[PDB]
Structures are given as C-alpha cells and as structure tokens.
Amino acid sequence: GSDILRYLDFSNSSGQIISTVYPFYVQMNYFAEIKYYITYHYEAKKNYDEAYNQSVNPLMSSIQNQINSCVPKKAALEKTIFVLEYPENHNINLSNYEAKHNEYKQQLDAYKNCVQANMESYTDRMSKFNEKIYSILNSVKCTDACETDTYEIMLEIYVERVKEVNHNNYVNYLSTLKASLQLGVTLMLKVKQEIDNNVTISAINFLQEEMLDIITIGEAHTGKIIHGKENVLKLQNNNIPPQVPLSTLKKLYFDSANFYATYKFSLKRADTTTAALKEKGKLLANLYNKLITYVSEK
C-alpha cells in the first residue's frame, strides 16, 4: 500500500509548504475559503465568483498539469524506494544497493525540482489575485457603518472546526516515535562496529532516515496546524465592536480565512503522514528481526 504522496511535501526558507497533492498551495485553499465566506455580500460574491473563474481556475489547471507531468518521475522514485526497502526480496547485493541509494537521492532531487518548478511565477499570480480581492470587497455596500455579522458567523464556524480534533496526539506521537528512531540510529552505529555491512543493515539505515524525514515534514505541518488553530481561538477571545469600518472588516475577513486555510491545508496532510509511519514502522520492525538472525549465529 505504498504511496509517497501521503507525506511528501516540500518546505523551504520562508516556511512555505509546497504540497504534491491538491490544492498544492495554501493560497488556493484560502481563495476557496473566501468564496463562501462572503456569500451574503451579494454583489461582492458575484464579482468574486467571476474573478475566481477567470484567474484561480486556469491557474489551478496549470499547476495540476505540471504535477501530472511529474508522475513518471514520481514512479521511478517510488520503484527505487521499493528496492531499497526490500533488498533481500529483490536479491540485490550491497554494492548495487549503495548505487540504488545514490540513484534515490538524484531522483528525489529531480522530482522536487519538477514539483517546485515555476513556484515563483505561481506565487506571483496568487499574489496578484489576492490584491484583486481587496478591491472586489469594495462592493460591500456599507462604507463606515459595516456590521460584523458575517465575521462572527464565520469565526464561530472556524472555531468549532478547529476544536474537532486534538492536535496534541499528533505531536506526542511524532515526538515519541522520533525519539525511538534516534535510539535506533545510535544502536545501528554500534551494530556497524560489530557486524559486517549487509543489505539488511543498509535497509534499516535507509528506513530510519526516511521515517525521520517524514517526521520532519509532519512537524512542519504540525506547526501550521497549531498556528492556525490558536489564532482562530484567539480571535474569539478578542472583543470586536458591533460596528467597524470597511477597511477593518476586510482585514478581519482575510485574517480569519487565512488562519483557517493554514490550519486546513496542513491538517489534511498530518493525517496521511501518520499512516505512512505505520507502514514504514511495520517494515522496520521486521528489518530489525531479520538482522537479529544474522547477529545471533555469528
């Protein structure tokens, strides 16, 4: 049941997470949230739906097509991983294993670049549409006397949604599993001092590293989930007047939707990441037991 897309996302310098799965960019999630956020501001809603269709939908299609072109690269990468995870059943030797691992690095790097291609052009267009949203909300008929009904409704919706899951169970699992993996790594350093290298040892070593890599990605998403949830909850605690000016209202709208979009974008990924760890963990335990047979009779 292997599927690298269950966990493989790419973070960077700024902390942005580019995902290999729909909707790929968090801004796209945000634009979808705004769409039904302003559903009761009638003129703003019709204008937004029109602008969304002209800008966001062709952009998503271009991104989706790019991701689709990366599939052959993804396939080659996953076939390499399959060899590295099951070397004994592949009947591959140590030397060819090391070459395969070398190939894996190149293939992971090549897939990442195929996925992150045009990242800058994509971000620019999302930024351009985001600025366009500000002027679209000028269609909100109130000017200085804007009522905070819609904001309070959506906030209540967001608050109830982030309360539905306890994020602490993800965090504690990742942290606790990470620690046991770090123990495993240290243990294997002692193993290589006592036992001649083989593909089982190499596989344990590889599987431990990619499990740590998955945790790193999972921690990145966990940070976004916590950031999004706490800020949503914070908005509820802060007092707002029954009446605010429109310029304020736009920011209240946008801040709310952005906090939830951030939460939602990473929450979806946090789930499947856990299932991937279970798959790898089961294999790792089997790899450990296989190695025991080697050590025992030597």
For Cl ion, the closer of residues 26 and 174 by Cβ is 174
Would you state the torsion angle of the CA atoms of residues 240, 48, 119, 219, taken in this order, to the nearest 10 degrees?
Answer: 40
CA gap 25, 60 in Å, rounded: 9
Q: What would you report as the CA-atom Rg of the chain, rounded to the nearest whole angstrom?
A: 24
Distance between start and end Cα atoms, the chain? 35
> Residues touching Cl ion: how many (CB under 5 A)?
3
Buried-exposed string 123-153: b where 16+ CB fall within 10 A, e elsewhere: eebbeebeeebeebbeebeeeeebebebbee
Site for Cl ion in 158-187 (CB under 5 A): 172-173, 176
On whether the CB atoms of residues 277 and 214 are closer than 8 A, the answer is: yes
Residue whose beta carbon is closest to Cl ion: 173
For Cl ion, the closer of residues 53 and 182 by Cβ is 182
On whether the CB atoms of residues 82 and 97 are closer than 8 A, the answer is: no
CA gap 43, 154 in Å, rounded: 19
CA gap 106, 83 in Å, rounded: 15
Site for Cl ion in 217-256 (CB under 5 A): none
* Least distance (Å) between residue 294 CB and Cl ion: 31
Is residue 120 part of an annotated ligand binding site?
yes
Q: Is 147 helix (H, G, I), strand (E, B) or coil?
A: strand
Site for Cl ion in 120-159 (CB under 5 A): none
For Cl ion, the closer of residues 179 and 189 by Cβ is 179
* Least distance (Å) between residue 176 CB and Cl ion: 5
* Least distance (Å) between residue 59 CB and Cl ion: 40
For Cl ion, the closer of residues 189 and 285 by Cβ is 285
* Least distance (Å) between residue 174 CB and Cl ion: 9
CA gap 151, 146 in Å, rounded: 11
* Least distance (Å) between residue 257 CB and Cl ion: 33
With a CB cutoff of 8 Å and minimum separation 6, the contacts of 107 are: 73, 76, 77, 80
For Cl ion, the closer of residues 108 and 277 by Cβ is 277
Site for Cl ion in 10-69 (CB under 5 A): none
* Least distance (Å) between residue 85 CB and Cl ion: 24
For Cl ion, the closer of residues 176 and 243 by Cβ is 176
Binding site for Cl ion (CB under 5 A): 172-173, 176
Per the annotation, where are the binding residues?
120
Annotated binding site for Ca(2+): 120
